[PDB]
């Protein structure tokens, strides 16, 4: 994938199809990701 932006367009509307599945998934995993993200930055015992 050095530069191929032809195929992306093929599957551009299919990405719409894809969201419809994971409609109810957005707000379930993120606070779980907000624990390791803690290690990276700060906030949590200096």
From Swiss-Prot:
Result when mutating residue 15 to E: In Oita; 60% of normal apoA-I and normal HDL cholesterol levels; rapidly cleared from plasma
Effect of residue 8 to S: In Boston; correlated with decreased levels of HDL cholesterol; correlated with decreased serum cellular cholesterol efflux; correlated with decreased lecithin-cholesterol acyltransferase (LCAT) activity
Effect annotated for changing residue 33 to S: In AMYLD3; plasma level of HDL and apoA-I protein were significantly lower in the patient
Coiled coil segments of this chain: none
Modification after translation, per record: Glycosylated. Palmitoylated.
Sequence repeat copies, ranges: 2-23, 24-45
Free-text tissue specificity from the UniProt record: Major protein of plasma HDL, also found in chylomicrons. Synthesized in the liver and small intestine. It is also present in increased levels in aortic lesions relative to native ApoA-I and increased levels are seen with increasing severity of disease.
Effect of residue 34 to P: In AMYLD3; uncertain significance
Record's disease association: Hypoalphalipoproteinemia, primary, 2: An autosomal recessive disorder of lipoprotein metabolism, biochemically characterized by severe apoA-I deficiency and severely reduced serum high-density lipoprotein cholesterol (HDL-C). Affected individuals have undetectable serum levels of apoA-I, and develop xanthomas and corneal opacities. The disease is generally associated with atherosclerosis and markedly increased cardiovascular risk.
Subunit structure: Homodimer. Interacts with NAXE and CLU. Component of a sperm activating protein complex (SPAP), consisting of APOA1, an immunoglobulin heavy chain, an immunoglobulin light chain and albumin. Interacts with NDRG1. Interacts with SCGB3A2. Interacts with NAXE and YJEFN3.
Family statement: Belongs to the apolipoprotein A1/A4/E family.
UniProt function note: Participates in the reverse transport of cholesterol from tissues to the liver for excretion by promoting cholesterol efflux from tissues and by acting as a cofactor for the lecithin cholesterol acyltransferase (LCAT). As part of the SPAP complex, activates spermatozoa motility.
Protein name: Apolipoprotein A-I
Organism expressing this protein natively: Homo sapiens (Human)
Gene: APOA1
């Amino acid at each position: 994938s050095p530069l191929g932006e032809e195929m992306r367009d093929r599957a551009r509307a299919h990405v719409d199809a894809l969201r419809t599945h994971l409609a109810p998934y957005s707000d379930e995993l993120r606070q779980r990701l907000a624990a390791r993200l803690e290690a990276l930055k700060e906030n949590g015992g200096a």
